Symmetry: C2
Subunit: 242 residues, 2 copies
């Protein structure tokens, strides 16, 4: 780039790219924010369920079950902590860099864009005033002033243009960084989550769950048997009640 016309032309293309960048990255921000919120809500719900299972012993019903519930509550508490760790990492390694891109970087672009537009308006006004004053008989003073304002407004325009162009050039790098960092952060958090979660979901736990399954089928069978007893008891009491 050697001059303002080539620079201004390239500025415009960079500004159009920044537009497409903003749109896509805003959509990515939003999708990621949904992952973030859902994962925080899941951590909280998982933890609350474990907490409720611990409270079973505190219910007063006018031991085997309390122990089974304690064992479930321990495993769930472990899973809840995997979810909580993931949530935390997701905030820091995924949400932060995508939020910083939208709230700091895309914002800087808009700000510098409008500073440049006003500088531009101002120079346009100086050029208009020069045109107005060119059409009349005048003294040196206002003629010197109006020329001078053209020079100083153009310089202001060029300087603000360059601040804007620098940020738009830098945006080309920031875009790449802000795409890859949060995806890397997300994947790294997930590897830890799945490995830690998988590692305590073991063969002992499988034995435990197999035994629960058997205890459930047992209760069902005892239930059906006792329903027959109650039906007999009902017939007896019908007789005895008259």
């Amino acid at each position: 780039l050697e001059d303002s016309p080539q620079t201004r032309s390239l500025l415009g293309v960079f500004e159009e790219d920044a537009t497409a960048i903003s749109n896509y990255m805003n959509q990515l921000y939003q999708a990621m924010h949904r992952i973030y919120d859902a994962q925080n809500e899941l951590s909280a719900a998982t933890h609350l369920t474990s907490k409720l299972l611990k409270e079973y012993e505190k219910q007063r019903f006018p031991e085997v079950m309390s122990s089974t519930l304690q064992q479930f509550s321990k495993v769930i508490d472990e899973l809840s902590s995997c979810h909580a760790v993931l949530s935390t990492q997701l905030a820091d390694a995924m949400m932060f860099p995508i939020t910083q891109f939208k709230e700091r970087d895309l914002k800087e672009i808009l700000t510098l864009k409008e500073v440049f537009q006003i500088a531009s308006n101002d120079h346009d006004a100086a050029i208009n005033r020069y045109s107005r004053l060119s059409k009349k008989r005048e003294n040196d003073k206002v003629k010197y002033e109006v020329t001078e304002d053209v020079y100083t407004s153009r310089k202001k325009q060029h300087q603000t243009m360059m601040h804007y162009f620098c940020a738009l050039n830098t945006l080309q790098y920031k875009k790449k960084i802000a795409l890859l960092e949060p995806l890397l952060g997300y994947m790294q958090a997930q590897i830890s989550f799945f490995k830690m979660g998988s590692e305590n979901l073991n063969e002992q736990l499988e034995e435990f769950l197999a035994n629960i399954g058997t205890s459930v089928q047992n209760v069902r069978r005892e239930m059906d048997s006792d329903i027959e007893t109650m039906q007999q008891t009902i017939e007896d009491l019908e007789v005895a009640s008259d």
Copy 2:
């Protein structure tokens, strides 16, 4: 149980237990429903993020990045499917049995409770009418009728009492079943989720992510270097613009 007084006394204790049961199981229903909703929202958000990454190639910016994004989108698509499978299993193996306990079983208890209360009101009315008619000179007809209504209202009362007591007895079993089944269903779904998820988060993926990390530090360095160039370009153009 041999007679109505012992039965009615025991009915009352079973009814008090059913109350404590309803309260706790309603709290469990609610906690589990939150896990359910959060996990469905997480599946959807994860899938949408992968879908957006696939759309990058379709953005028009006035190749290396598109390939990196495709590789991320594939791994995330795999994780999204783990989440979707879990969601489905959670509906069927956790939500259903706890919902059925609240919507079918606790509802049956309330229904049979009120049928018995009305039968009870009705017999109370028959006893009251007998009392009223005991106090006057009357013919056989209304005296036979009022005695007869006492017998038939008591029988109705006893029958509705026994339907209620049967369901309350059955509830003692259903409570155990409805606690253990959804916890078993939840844990079994999670074992599959963590194992399937963990198993494709491999050493090849670690290599990929390590390379991303390096590509990010590279972009940052290129950025800082190019910012220096742009600052020099800016100084040059300031001169050339006047």
